[PDB]
Amino acid sequence: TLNGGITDMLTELANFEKNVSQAIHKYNAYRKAASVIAKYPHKIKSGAEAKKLPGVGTKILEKIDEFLATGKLRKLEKIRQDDTSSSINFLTRVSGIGPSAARKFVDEGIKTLEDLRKNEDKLNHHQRIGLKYFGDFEKRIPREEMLQMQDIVLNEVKKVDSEYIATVCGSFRRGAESSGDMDVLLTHPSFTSESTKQPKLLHQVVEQLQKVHFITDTLSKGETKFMGVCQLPSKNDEKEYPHRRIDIRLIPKDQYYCGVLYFTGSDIFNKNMRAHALEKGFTINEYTIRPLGVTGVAGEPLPVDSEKDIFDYIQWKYREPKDRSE
DNA sequence: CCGACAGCGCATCAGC
DNA sequence: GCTGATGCGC
DNA sequence: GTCGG
Ligand SMILES: Cc1cn([C@H]2C[C@H](O)[C@@H](COP(=O)(O)OP(=O)(O)[C@@](F)(Cl)P(=O)(O)O)O2)c(=O)[nH]c1=O
Ligand SMILES: [Mg+2]
Ligand code: NA
Ligand code: NA
Ligand code: NA
Numbered sequence: 001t002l003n004g005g006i007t008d009m010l011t012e013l014a015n016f017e018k019n020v021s022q023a024i025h026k027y028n029a030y031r032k033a034a035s036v037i038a039k040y041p042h043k044i045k046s047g048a049e050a051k052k053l054p055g056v057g058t059k060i061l062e063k064i065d066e067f068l069a070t071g072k073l074r075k076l077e078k079i080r081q082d083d084t085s086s087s088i089n090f091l092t093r094v095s096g097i098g099p100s101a102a103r104k105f106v107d108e109g110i111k112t113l114e115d116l117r118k119n120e121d122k123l124n125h126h127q128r129i130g131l132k133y134f135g136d137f138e139k140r141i142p143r144e145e146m147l148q149m150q151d152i153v154l155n156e157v158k159k160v161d162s163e164y165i166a167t168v169c170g171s172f173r174r175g176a177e178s179s180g181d182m183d184v185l186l187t188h189p190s191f192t193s194e195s196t197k198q199p200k201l202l203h204q205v206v207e208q209l210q211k212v213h214f215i216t217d218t219l220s221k222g223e224t225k226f227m228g229v230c231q232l233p234s235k236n237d238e239k240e241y242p243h244r245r246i247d248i249r250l251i252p253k254d255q256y257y258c259g260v261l262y263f264t265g266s267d268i269f270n271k272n273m274r275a276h277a278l279e280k281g282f283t284i285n286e287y288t289i290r291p292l293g294v295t296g297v298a299g300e301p302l303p304v305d306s307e308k309d310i311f312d313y314i315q316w317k318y319r320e321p322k323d324r325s326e
Numbered sequence: 327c328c329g330a331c332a333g334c335g336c337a338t339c340a341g342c
Numbered sequence: 343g344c345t346g347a348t349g350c351g352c
Numbered sequence: 353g354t355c356g357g
Binding site: 017023025026027028029030032033054055056057058059060 | 354
């Protein structure tokens with residue numbers, strides 16, 4: 001974090017535009033600028049120097065000049081004093097409350113943690129569980145706990161059916177020393193792009209993890225994506241571990257490499273890589289890479305035998321997961 | 327100048 | 343109930 | 353908010 005003050009400023013601007021202004025493109029522009037500045041290997045000395053990077057334009061360069069000269073940004077100092085903006089920003093920190101619900105609650109006089117606590121009947125199920133674990137979901141997960149969680153998930157999945165493969169993705173797979181949640185990619189030979197020979201493939205795993213009291217709550221659940229809450233077991237007289245977010249994604253087994261590329265991220269890396277694919281005339285999702293015809297219509301899926309094959313198609317040198325943390 | 331900005335699963339609601 | 347739009351979060 | 357054409 002040679003440039004942590006600047007990237008913090010840009011992230012706070014991004015959050016303002018997303019949560020308060022509901023200007024999703026300004027939000028993505030600011031996160032793109034923070035990302036490229038975060039990886040720039042020199043302490044930025046001027047907005048001019050920063051404007052040389054792709055994604056920093058005239059407006060952000062001027063903000064950086066103000067921040068360098070004074071250590072702050074008047075625009076943000078004013079946002080911080082504004083009650084409505086501060087209230088809306090805070091409410092979106094609850095899982096399942098986004099910009100729209102945050103403004104609806106604030107318009108109703110529901111502005112603080114206790115207001116939510118006293119109006120639990122105005123929350124949907126996701127939001128209710130988000131509020132329940134508000135503190136826990138602020139806490140990062142040390143990699144050592146991620147390794148215990150992996151061992152549980154892998155062993156419990158193996159007990160349901162030895163032909164499942166579970167892969168922990170997200171920031172853990174990129175080598176991070178701490179993660180915000182646990183992302184699990186799941187495959188089974190019964191579920192391919194050709195057929196689903198077995199029902200309840202995801203449910204079976206979730207059920208086993210609930211049985212052993214690892215999964216404690218559900219945020220949403222369908223046939224291929226589970227989002228919920230889990231907890232490591234603690235020892236006698238030991239304080240309990242925080243509850244943790246867990247996402248499980250069941251992907252057709254023959255589409256594993258597109259799925260593991262997607263679920264490894266980062267999100268910004270995925271955005272960069274998918275944008276580059278579009279420029280090269282391909283489209284990449286978590287299932288396939290397909291060519292784009294002269295009309296923009298996605299073609300037929302291309303053969304994929306490794307993560308590197310996806311990079312080769314779009315003429316990118318291969319990047320290890322540890323180098324995808326944008 | 328200005329069109330595009332990655333891609334999608336699940337929850338919820340509205341219109342029928 | 344279906345279908346399509348919107349919210350939210352990977 | 354930024355950028356390619
Ligand atoms: C949020 C998001 C995620 N993804 C992919 C890429 C992420 O790496 C993967 C997991 O989503 P997370 O939000 O858990 O991201 P993460 O990289 O694991 C993380 F670093 Cl933000 P954390 O460790 O906090 O979960 O889903 C996207 O493609 N687009 C997205 O908008
Ligand atoms: Mg994650
Ligand atoms: Na630039
Ligand atoms: Na939220
Ligand atoms: Na996640």
